[model samples]
Target chain A: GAMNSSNYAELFNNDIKLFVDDTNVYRVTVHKTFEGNVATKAINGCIFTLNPKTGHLFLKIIHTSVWAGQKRLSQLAKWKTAEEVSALVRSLPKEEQPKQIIVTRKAMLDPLEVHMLDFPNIAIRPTELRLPFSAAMSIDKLSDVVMKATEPQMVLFNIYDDWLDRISSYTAFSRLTLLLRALKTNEESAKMILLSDPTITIKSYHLWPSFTDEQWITIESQMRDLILTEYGRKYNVNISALTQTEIKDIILGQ
Target chain B: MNTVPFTSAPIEVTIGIDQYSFNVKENQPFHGIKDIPIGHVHVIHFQHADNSSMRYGYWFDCRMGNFYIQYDPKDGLYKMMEERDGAKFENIVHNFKERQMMVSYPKIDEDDTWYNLTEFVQMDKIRKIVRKDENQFSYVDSSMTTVQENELSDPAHSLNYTVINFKSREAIRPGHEMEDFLDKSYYLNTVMLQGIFKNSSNYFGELQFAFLNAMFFGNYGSSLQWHAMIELICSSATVPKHMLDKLDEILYYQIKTLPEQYSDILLNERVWNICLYSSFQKNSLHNTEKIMENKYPELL
Candidate 1:
């Protein structure tokens, strides 16, 4: 029996009890997908409360790029002899010479002008990408194309989470669709995140410890309102139209 | 001065019984025996004046020979060594140590005024003749001979000796000061000429020249050459517009002709080139033909 506002209070009090006792608390998450794929899942909505005295804010974000391996370029091969390549390159027309090759790793971006335009403030820093043997072998094949090309160039792709409620309704399905769309959009630009995880499990005990039953009820309602407001602003969709049962059905199917 | 008799044939006379010698000592006056300058041409001869001493003296019958005479400058014993008749045999070896001998005799005296009656021998020559029974006349170490041989073998060191010796000789003569100045000036002119002919930059050529100059002439000679050349180049009022420029051009071609002309006589290329080039550049006015024909004729 869903008790509307009273039900929210009951759930909030349970959350507070679990936090203080450090036991039996489950973290809730909402995800989004684009292009009907389950593999591209992204967190679309999340909420939690914190005790001010402990200076701890229980943080919940709709999505984070850490769950997607977006920085690894295991598909590119390394250039063995730059001088020999440069000689062969001189045979090409001068204007065409500067843009023919592509570098996959962020480490080799120095000679190329293919800058990361979207992430203006983010610099291409060296991050390790340990891939399995098959993936590494594929990267080596891509690297051969980059090495033999007349112009040496590179592009760095990074993943970031965005809060959107319309996409959150069909969480798992939307997430998988989004990942497939991203991959299809740019085959050359696809890079792997080093340690990606689809599900981010956080303990409620680590989040809120000082809320009384009534106070916990008000806090949970406020948090849900805040998330709904943010998602409406970003995705221009009303979250209430989609029932919780329908959302669960979509996730189970995905 | 007393006269010694002139005789075409050497006079064989016994000094004491059974002792024999060729007495060229004549009744006619011995004119100040002319100091033979280097490269002068003459002839020499030798003969046995006695039967008993022939064994000891016959070895000197060869055309080339070295004469050793003792001159004790301290004892003023020059006369004892030079005199034709004297019992100064004991003092001979002692004074010979201080005496200078000719490294090679260009030509011996034709009239036999001075006799070098055998092939030129080094210190080994004396050791060969020394009687074994007579310990008093044993061999002396020939380290000085070794030092001279070593010095002569190295061209750079040998040139140093020549330049220094020439300068020292010039310093003693009042009129010869200008000669030193002129010789040094010639050296500088030739160095500059060689530099230009070789297509070397002025600075590099002068720098290398200075190094070689210092090695052969010491720092004093090197500095003096530079100063003199600079002064001469600067002092030309007639060529005020391009004095140094004209000087460089004129000296350059002059240096090029040096090696071709004097390669046989001058073994060391540095010294030979400098000397021959200087002579050709400074003294030969005819050599200006090439420079005079150039478009920049004013440089000549």
Candidate 2:
């Protein structure tokens, strides 16, 4: 049967209803660059929320299935309870409340949901973390700056899951968080940070060989945060205040 | 004692070839042509094409069979009607030989602007070149090669493969009023191109028109156009049907249009206006409205 007047009302109601969840916060920030002008979609698929129930910061990669066969909500990085996340952040000796937080040509073509999120400079796809910033800690330090050059880094967090038992979700998030914070600390030098592959090097390599897999998982989960905190304290680099503007600047540089 | 001249076509007259024929010749020698009752029985003479001399006949009616003849306005045309035991109807059968061709037009490379969602990208062919403390490493394309940073000018430092920075954000300037988005080709094209790129199968081009129609409604230039745009955008794209909840998140939560609390009122208003002024669209207004009605019955 042909669509009737009531049908149009129903569609209109649905359109008005979509925004009921308060999605309008993200924006496409523009910046002036020497290479003409460039833009970043600014945190499209990626979302960070302080869970009201748990108080934990959740990183969700949301996708809308426009065509077909796509899950509405897909790919979320593991997160700790708010108490645990707060502990992880507080574990940093000088921790402060932090600022808020794609493939291929063909194979790189993301699902339709991704483009809708607007392709932020740093984003977490279903598989990998796309952190385009340079690593701060180097094999040795020669210049005033250690990490953060021009190009970005992809933390193969998903592929690196082989080491998951050896790392804490909070620890991995904090390390990346701290890395982003420091880059935010530099402001001009900070690039996009994505939490894709869960990356954490267990500090006690010698102790690692002796522990059972379960023991390693628990110990690493707990100790990795400690190690990251210790690392942050020694370097005097707490997590940088990564603002939306900084992300906009990074896109400008590219 | 003068008998009425025979007024009907001869009973032996065949309407179609051999077995597949609509026997419309008058079988009954009635006084005069009157409105025939629907169940009036008729005879269809069947003959073998190979053996023209062999013939047989069967009784049929509109209720039990498809063959019939009547004084319809369309004379000599094949009339078909099917009904239950008590009903009557008539319809003309049309045979159209249609030619299907692919039209050629100017094609813009979508990749140059936004990321192509359905393009088969050779992930292996694409590589990234990075410089660290003056030493450069090329990863993933050919082989892992390291070169001195001073040799940056080397072609190895450059890229041959097209650089598709899928990470770049939206291009709109900040703080543009809602009116700014009106009829802006960027938002419209982004939604459309994304629609075209995502539905690679295109479900035989039905979705393409849906997408265009959705875009057309988006251009209707109402205060609620954005509302219409986003809703129609999701609705139009969902014909093949995927999860739309997250798309609502992108447009609503991430796009910074409005608060969630007011969604119901805004939605009701937008729908009210659509219904109020549906006279604007000639082709799909009813269908578009009906789709909405069916999808969200609560709105009705």
Candidate 3:
């Protein structure tokens, strides 16, 4: 039997309602090629609709982009909770505070959802850590540089199941906290960065003139050994075997 | 109903004519008319006279109508008059009596471009020539090979076969747009030909017209001709009642348009010969039981 007019209306309404309420939806922008001699670039995004009745997913995409990049950022902000990071940025002195600030937040949707918060505002300030270096790099890089400069060169020696369990839990927690902080401080930056693949690594650092080359190398090696010890235990392999080139490649690729 | 002289005579004599002359033996008593239909207006049979075959001609009158028959011993069947008319009857009898001379042969009129028996017969021969060539390669495998052979042999068959199959497959395949398929650029030749044929009445000969109609309808046109001939040769078969009905329609239309320039005798003879040869070839090809059976199971 053919569906009635009322039935069609009902179906349309139900679908639209599902689309409006959808929270897990993400827009995908794909670049495609055409045969003709017209325009070459195209931006398309889809709102994924998961059917409650059939468990079948349907995708609806706009023929043209509606707000471009910022639309995706706004959608991510709706799901993220990080008021504390924003409050911390607001508390800084007027002189100490950055002149221009951009907050970015990002979250990973697969395996486990991890959020990142970043305060790009701090980079604008002319402090020990200044604007150009921060603007050139990301929140994750800034955090890594700060950790390398301020923290003690901590090390651990173990090759056991308990050590492996401890390393795995510690790495997962540390990475999650780092991501959350990045998202709270700079939501847009966090969102953009999180869209990339999971693993990230940073190489080289900015140091003050006070630190000698020998001291810098020694501290860098110690920090590297600490990271290796933790990651080696988690991965169940010897960290010493990894060449510097391989490590740098992984960091740059991410 | 006085005693008919041919029927009542104690010592009967049968005079057979050309081609039929081969059936007559040296010393056989002629029976008046045996195994003849009840209403046959004329009865004809064949006989052989000392190594020369003469077609035997006879006329029979019964309750329904009179029939003029000619017997060809080679085929071993009484050839009944396909048309009925007093002038045609007289001409056939006159021709038969004169040592079986071909009094009227097919002729084509150049003035009107009207096809008399000559053009008709020539066209018929052309059809046979095509069938003969095609029969040479019927055993080839693959649709492409079959199509190639058909195209190389008969231009009309080549054009129609490729178009029909392609259109049918295109129309039904999933995701095909009807608009795309019907687009003029996509082999519009077949569509134009179909339109022309459909609009034109029985102006063309029977074989040409029927061939066009079959292609338009997506029915296998040449295959029907092939089937009819196969049946006739293999089993000494009569055409099936349905096919006979169709053939009658085609023949009626064709005979109506036959040019007046040629005498009825020549026109009829040419038409008769063409129909006969076509049926014979088709049946012979079809009757090669082992080969044809395996090759065309649907035909069997």
Candidate 4:
């Protein structure tokens, strides 16, 4: 069976995973439902573990958004013309009109408010979503955060396991990624364990031996391409690689 | 499963998942930023129905064609926005959606913070141009600002960019850059943008026709499929890895700088002409099939 509700649910009702008395493993997850009916569903609760604290080791999976046939945007969004987009945007205050213009179907809403950016102008890049947690903070303080994690405004829903492989970019994903990068970069992480179902295994800041070696030479270019798309300058750090290192403490939640 | 319709009117509609009622002017990109300020900021505000307001700023983004605000859900307003349910949630959703609840630009204001993008795109540089109809034209050397440029501009200050080629008094080149201008997109490659299609063309076009023929099939810019386009181009055997890196930088600029400028353009379009043609200029951007062929060369 996959790592299911018990590990996550038990945290709230009891302080089972509270304070770092000893090294332990826990995942930071939000309340989620994988239903097909709502615009939600894209968000998959992140599954990751650290040494009673967050880690620097990270893993990021990218979902690349592309135009269909000969650089064509197939999905149609609301609002059809430049004027309409501008009008709706104009109605908002200056701060609201902020994320600037364009009008068309299959477009992205502006990153900033106050505007509906146009579509087919630039291809909407894949949304980038990260997992949440501090790469540095101890797992003791996690309950407050896990409890605070809210259902994001947008997400893609799916079975938990596949989410690891095909996780699309979204609000929570990014928050989680930054959480991993920011608080979890622990060189002192004595013990590390990969979470499962929505499996997460610790990884490195930069790609090294995996793609650079001669054995993977044929796949290097493809791997490099993946890196370019997935890693950006800031790698969406989580935990999804396989490796081992030595640390002082060891504890696995069962 | 995408069934949103192609709406064409001034009624309330769903561009996203909200209901809005409004109309737009034909040409209204007035008062936009011209010279990109490397280290600059522009503040905007958002008002609630209660009359109380919250504010955000627009920092400099070299790539964004508009401004973007970062949202935080730490305060009472955030929870209030969250508690939007029953009859009340609708208000917050529209106002708080996608970095919502911002400070509005005023009808007649005397104060400011944060700058706009595209003050560069429509710089009022003296230009002598040829026209398609009747007679050709030339912008008489006028120092005064026109339209709303006065609000967003200061003729007294030294203007940094003017989308001009002082070197030859020529048209904007495909590869170019300056304090007030940029063309890095053009520098990437045809496969960079042209590779976005199947019968890609970068080498030759009649009057840039090669790039022009590499037009988009639909009207919208970014959608769900945008990432796949980047993958196809990046992974394409045709697109040199170096070129993909450059594209990476351009995209990085969007992610990194857009909110500062306006919001980044082409976050996900030909619809990107606003930012693209102005900053980078479209050469030709392409198609698929070969995506896995290169991976599964057996398909070839």
* iRMSD value for model 3: 23.9
Shift in Å, residue A237, candidate 4: 24
Q: Please tell me which model should have the higher TM-score, number 2 or number 3.
A: 3
DockQ, all models = 0.01, 0.06, 0.01, 0.01
Residue-wise C-alpha lDDT for candidate 1, range A1-254, written one tens digit per residue? 21222332332221221111001011124455576644333322211112111222222221233234543211111111121223333443654232222222343332111222212232322212111111211232223433343433321111112212222322322232233232333223322321122342222332112333464345434433443444455568777786777544432232
List the candidates ranked by TM-score, beginning with the highest. 3, 2, 4, 1
Task: Give the higher-TM-score candidate: 3 or 4.
Answer: 3
**Mind giving the per-residue lDDT tens digits that candidate 2 earns over B115-231?**
111122121212222222121111111122223222324554332321111212332323321111222334323533353334323221222222221121121112232343333
User: What is the TM-score of chain A, computed separately for every candidate?
Assistant: 0.18, 0.21, 0.23, 0.17
Off by over 4 Å in 4: A1-143, A147-254, B1-300
Candidate rank order under lDDT: 3, 2, 1, 4
Give TM-scores for every candidate, taking all chains together and pairing residue i with residue i.
Answer: 0.15, 0.18, 0.19, 0.16
> How many backbone clashes does every candidate have?
37, 42, 57, 113
lDDT of 4 by residue, A1-254 (tens): 11222443321232212111101112222344566343211211221221111111211111111111212111111111222233433454654232212111113232211122222222222112122332323332232333344531111111122222333323223323332332243312211212211333323321112222333333323323233333333456432441222110110110
lDDT of each: 0.27, 0.28, 0.30, 0.24
What is the per-residue lDDT of model 4 for residues B58-169, given as tens digits with 9 covering 90 to 100? 1122222222222242541211011213345333334333342222222223422212211211111111111112211111111323222333464432112112121121
Question: Best lDDT goes to which candidate?
Answer: 3
**Candidate 2 lDDT over residue span A17-38, tens digit each:** 1100112112234666678777
